[PDB]
Design a protein around this nucleic acid. Sequence first.
RNA 1: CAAUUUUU
RNA 2: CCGCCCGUCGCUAGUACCGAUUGAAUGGCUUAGUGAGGCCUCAGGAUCUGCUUAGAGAAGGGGGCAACUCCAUCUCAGAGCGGAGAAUUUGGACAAACUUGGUCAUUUAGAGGAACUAAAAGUCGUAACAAGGUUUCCGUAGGUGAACCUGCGGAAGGAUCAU
RNA 3: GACCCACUCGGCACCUUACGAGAAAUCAAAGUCUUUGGGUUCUGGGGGGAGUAUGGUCGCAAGGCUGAAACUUAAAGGAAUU
RNA 4: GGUCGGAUUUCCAACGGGGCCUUUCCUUCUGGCUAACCUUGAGUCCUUGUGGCUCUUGGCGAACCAGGACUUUUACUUUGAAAAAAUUAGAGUGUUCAAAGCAGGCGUAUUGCUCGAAUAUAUUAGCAUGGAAUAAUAGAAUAGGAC
RNA 5: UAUCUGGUUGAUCCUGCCAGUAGUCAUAUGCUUGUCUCAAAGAUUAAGCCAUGCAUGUCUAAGUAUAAGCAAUUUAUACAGUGAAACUGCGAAUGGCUCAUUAAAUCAGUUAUCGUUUAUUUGAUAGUUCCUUUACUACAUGGUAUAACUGUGGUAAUUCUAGAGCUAAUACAUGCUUAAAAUCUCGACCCUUUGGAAGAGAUGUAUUUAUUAGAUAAAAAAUCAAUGUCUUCGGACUCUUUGAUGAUUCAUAAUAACUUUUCGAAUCGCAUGGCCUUGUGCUGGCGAUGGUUCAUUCAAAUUUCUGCCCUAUCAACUUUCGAUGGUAGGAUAGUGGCCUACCAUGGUUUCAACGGGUAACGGGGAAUAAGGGUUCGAUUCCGGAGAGGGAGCCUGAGAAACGGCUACC
RNA 6: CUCUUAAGGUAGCCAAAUGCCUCGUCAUCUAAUUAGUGACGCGCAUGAAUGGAUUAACGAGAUUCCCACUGUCCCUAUCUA
Lengths: 153, 124, 260, 188
Amino acid sequence: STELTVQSERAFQKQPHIFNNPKVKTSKRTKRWYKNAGLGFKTPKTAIEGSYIDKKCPFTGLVSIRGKILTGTVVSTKMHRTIVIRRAYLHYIPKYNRYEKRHKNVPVHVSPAFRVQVGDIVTVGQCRPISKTVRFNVVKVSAAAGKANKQFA
Amino acid sequence: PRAPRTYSKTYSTPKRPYESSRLDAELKLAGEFGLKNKKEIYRISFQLSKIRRAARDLLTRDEKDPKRLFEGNALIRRLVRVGVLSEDKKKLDYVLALKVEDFLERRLQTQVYKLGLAKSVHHA
Amino acid sequence: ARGPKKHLKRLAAPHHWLLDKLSGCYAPRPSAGPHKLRESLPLIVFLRNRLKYALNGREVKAILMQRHVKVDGKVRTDTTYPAGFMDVITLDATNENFRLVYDVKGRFAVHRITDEEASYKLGKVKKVQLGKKGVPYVVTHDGRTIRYPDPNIKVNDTVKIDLASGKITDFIKFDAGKLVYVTGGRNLGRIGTIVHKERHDGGFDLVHIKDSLDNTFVTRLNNVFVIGEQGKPYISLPKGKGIKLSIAEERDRRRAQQGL
Amino acid sequence: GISRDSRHKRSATGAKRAQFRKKRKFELGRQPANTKIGAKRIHSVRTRGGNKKYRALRIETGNFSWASEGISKKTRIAGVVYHPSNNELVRTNTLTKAAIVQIDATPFRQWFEAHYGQTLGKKSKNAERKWAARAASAKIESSVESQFSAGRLYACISSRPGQSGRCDGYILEGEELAFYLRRLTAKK
RNA sequence: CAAUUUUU
RNA sequence: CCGCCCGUCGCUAGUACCGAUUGAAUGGCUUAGUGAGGCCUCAGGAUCUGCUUAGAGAAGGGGGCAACUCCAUCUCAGAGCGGAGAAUUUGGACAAACUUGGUCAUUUAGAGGAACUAAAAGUCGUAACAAGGUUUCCGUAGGUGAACCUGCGGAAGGAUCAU
RNA sequence: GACCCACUCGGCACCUUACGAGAAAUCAAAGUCUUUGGGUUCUGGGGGGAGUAUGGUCGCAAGGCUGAAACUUAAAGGAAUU
RNA sequence: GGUCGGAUUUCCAACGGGGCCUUUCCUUCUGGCUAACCUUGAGUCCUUGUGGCUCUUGGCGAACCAGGACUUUUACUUUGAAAAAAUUAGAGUGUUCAAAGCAGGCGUAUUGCUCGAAUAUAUUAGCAUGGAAUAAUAGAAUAGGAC
RNA sequence: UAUCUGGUUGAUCCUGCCAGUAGUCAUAUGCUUGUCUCAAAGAUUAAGCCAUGCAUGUCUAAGUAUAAGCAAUUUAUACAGUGAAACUGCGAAUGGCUCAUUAAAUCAGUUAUCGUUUAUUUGAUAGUUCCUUUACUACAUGGUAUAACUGUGGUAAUUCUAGAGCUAAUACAUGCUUAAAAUCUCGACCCUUUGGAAGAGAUGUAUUUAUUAGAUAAAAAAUCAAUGUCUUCGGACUCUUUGAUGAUUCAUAAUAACUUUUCGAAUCGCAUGGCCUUGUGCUGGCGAUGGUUCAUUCAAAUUUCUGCCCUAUCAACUUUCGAUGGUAGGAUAGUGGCCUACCAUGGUUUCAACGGGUAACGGGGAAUAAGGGUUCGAUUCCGGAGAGGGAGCCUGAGAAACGGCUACC
RNA sequence: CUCUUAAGGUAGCCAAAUGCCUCGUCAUCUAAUUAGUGACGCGCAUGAAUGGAUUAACGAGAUUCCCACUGUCCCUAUCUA
């Protein structure tokens, strides 16, 4: 979500209490640390070869994934680095012996290394609290659409 | 601040009050063995009710159901430990066929009567 | 709110204590315990209601001043001192030895064990760890940690205790045919010894459990506990033998207990 | 008195969240300490559960790190020049987390040249074989050696000044000093 | 052509 | 049909609705202000102290003419340097309570105005039930004392299912 | 090209008849409804007060839309035979 | 129905369950197991020979485990796990029945003996598993496809 | 356990109300009242007000004893049996009571704490203690600074309180005292450079910072500098070292510093032994309290996942006093626009948000009962809020406590 | 139904600048009110282009009240050209 000397703005943020030896000409000339998510959740190489810092990221920051996991679709990339998710579901009323379609939307913090737009049936995970509202975080996007990678006009 | 102890009512009045022969049918049942009120044929009919309500729910449920094979067989033995009916009607479907005056017949009023010694249910 | 709760009434401890309803009062509240929840029981519930040694609440407190109670060689004159699982409440003079096991009807037991074999408990481990300055240790039912154990055994097995301290002796793993034993829940503690495990990596753990009824069921991991090698068991099981014998022939067995 | 939980603070949709359960004790935020320089006038506070913690006021000498040697000698301070969040804190010369301070250049030089003897920047045989075997190993970087010349070292309070009260942190080394000379060259 | 009221 | 029923008015009664009062009160947000007290902190350092060191009335007497010279005690001292530090008091953040406006909702008081509804045939009349004696009923507009009347496009719950 | 006959589609209706439907009058839909479920929008819970009072909205106005309560009282009523 | 409210040597019909095979259901790479002996060379108690055996040579890795790699997502539904008890239903039970409660009851009452203190039900939320009809369901169109 | 009857009429059929019927773990009330077990009770309206009296205190073999209180009788001839007050520790933060506020708030189930603390309960638990050097000096035991008490006081007053006189410690503050070994830095240096080394000192844990390791899909070599072991002496040789999870910057170890240096027994009880060198020699039982640290336990605190009564004569609520997010901090037991500066304009919605109402505490249930349900649940059990109305705070492990305090009404 | 000459205050409005009686009454404003404002009405003697009623903006028009403000006044003093 950020380019142009990626550690950009007025302050200075870095992966905490890890230092590279400030003179020796070692391999990547940095020590980029990441976190194995586990449970078959393929941590993509965009965090491994990335350059962002983003302490809130589950793949390079100080947050794990320890609660439940949910699903749903994307409706707003209008923010900065977060997207909200509309879980749609049916609901049984006991009286009329019939169902009804309800929903409610939920905000989810997203790592800047991913790529998410409209549609994009997504999988998110429960986290420690990270904003005023965002109680979750995403794990994987892995979703096609109405013929993405194929359509042209 | 304490634990309760429960209570329960063990009769229910009939719904429609006034039919000429129906009140006098339970005057035949009043006049048979010397009752004192109309409440104590309401309560065995109440005991006829929620036993036959209990009898209906196993019969509508499954055959070779062990809940029916337990509380159908333990029901009919407790039905005959008081000895309302004998061994001749022990096949679990005569509990529907049971009639008022048969729950009356094993009461201690009309058992002292039938076993000599009293000459009269009013004396019993 | 605002502090701990140094009382609880009856109806709030579960069925497995078998107290009275119309006492109209507060329950025996367990004290702070070494081992587990209020699904354990304090010793006074084991004495005056199961074993039936006393009536008064002044009475049972007066036994413990005579110093006859003992678990593990430890004094413990606390009245409502909680009692864990398989933690043998040995006695002084009167010489009995009671192991805490589960019978086939929900609540715990009244089961004697012999004089010898009563000098060891049996211990579930929950947490193996290397910690401060290289000192390895295990934990137990009561969390009684033991310095310098048998190295690299794992979490989730059972442990034999030597009762001078921990001084652990023998590891008992889990394999395709051993002893396992439920502890807690709706279908607590008969035997199912194993049939085949699974894992469910990540969320929870389940185990297939095959009775001497020879069907199966599944109880989750926190009730799962291993006894030992199959057909050995370290504890003489109480006289229900761990079946969940069915209610259709529970009734046929108990009038064959009376003979009519 | 000031609270921290969200029984105030208007909800997600935006309703006026009505209140009960007036301001408790288990969320209380103590008023700040906004610490300064001036040599050890520090008071402690009682806290929750049985514990103790340090409000540092007026600190000037504390331990640092290089970090290329693991040295940590208690040197003095001189003052902050660029706070990374806001800018009012340097007009009064306070110190917080990540405060870009300058110190003295002196006490590490007693460590450095007694251990190497080069000598920047322009006796027994047990340690004579030390600098005669660390050839171009003590040498760091040119701009740092130019930065010794004014008699100041750019340091960074990484520790928390008002929670644990220690006078602690490290000094700028590597790319980070180029970040605090991004704008701090052409800021005037 | 015009014809109204006639009274719990 | 010596059937039924329509409206004004008269008397007897009740019912809500409005209404001058820049209405009144309670409660909830509110802008502008005063801000009690308590906390964190800048100072205050009263009044209780001990340490050390330079002189001494009394005499302590390691010895003796006095002396020298031992710490000095009954204690003033002249200096430092700490220890707890109470009133007081600036700054900062919480804020009870109050003042002033505006909104919102509830309740309550009001001179009097038009309505509605009941209630022994009261007069004035027949409007509708038979072609109700001018067929009836709609929507709209106009007049009138009351029913009502008339004009306009309809419709037949019609008094013709019919050239 | 109009017509005669036979057929069919879609109309607008008519006549007979009922098995069927209902309170009856009547009905080819008002049928296939206690042998109760093809979808799908709306409306009504006694008659009065009344399409009235307050509140809103649309109008230049007449007025239109949405729309009670207080009180009142056993019918108002639909069809049919004499 | 063998011979005691009651039991079979194979066998009759139905009920449902599984492995298959029919063009045919087949998550896969690396190992330790294994898992077959269908192997195989020899000996191979008892017969005329793995029907009772071995050292067992490619002698079928994934049913017992964990790594590389994915996997059309849903409803629905079985079972289990699951809701503190009382309360609801409900077996025992001389509280004398009943309201109840959870006891009691049996010897031997000479200084003991044992049964109990059951059982279901509890729906919407979540978890795991069996099922693939019914209703959505998306991956082969400028092939930028599968193998 | 599925039940209906009368009234529009001259009479008939029918839509449709009223009345009639039955129970209330549902209230009041009229009349009547013999037996026996069981038992809710100022919830409904005014969470409006209070007279009076009581509901939180606490002792052992084993804290503090000169009571000028006792009780004695042999003991403890300094005490030891008790025993007030009062100090110290501990409880008071449970229990009980009400439902006014309270409509995604609490709450039912349901995970989460890798994001935290926890006196008490358990179990493990501290061979380094200052290195001013060896006369700092008690480690065979140093100190204050004091209660209760005694003397005379004040005010009419309250669980109000003064100056003076001594003394207690488990209150309070100092403070040593039982090893060895290895490492690192230095140097006494000479004797040499590919060198060694007496000895100057440190090393417990806490605390904060910074670093390193914590690895481990598959097997062999060439190649450039230093070069451990050993030797045929071409040169050759090495088991060369890993805990849990899904995973971590985790537990951890190591390195250099670190603290108005935190802690690491100057406390009491019963017993009397062994020892051989009978010396205030050296050993040694069973406890009781208290203490750091880890893991429990007892709990607290946040937190995901669903469910809500009536209202569109409630149609757009939300921010410049954070509304939503990012950036960096300040506090916090720790998370977080919780708060602060800068930056971005965002959140919810015709699935009903927002606003209003609610005789709305939330649930486990209760009443009537074919099935399908309608209506209560203030009240026995669980959880929440409150102690006349809003604020604020100390003590304590636990409170924004109310039978605790401060101020205003 | 009837008379003076013909037809005999309708829509409305008021003690109004229009109401003598009259400072009419009732309510409201203040501490008090021949003043104000809202209703009353058989109106000496209101009224339909001799125009009747209600009016948004405006008025060097006339009134009554409230809030800020001051020698208007309490209670006057002084200084300047």
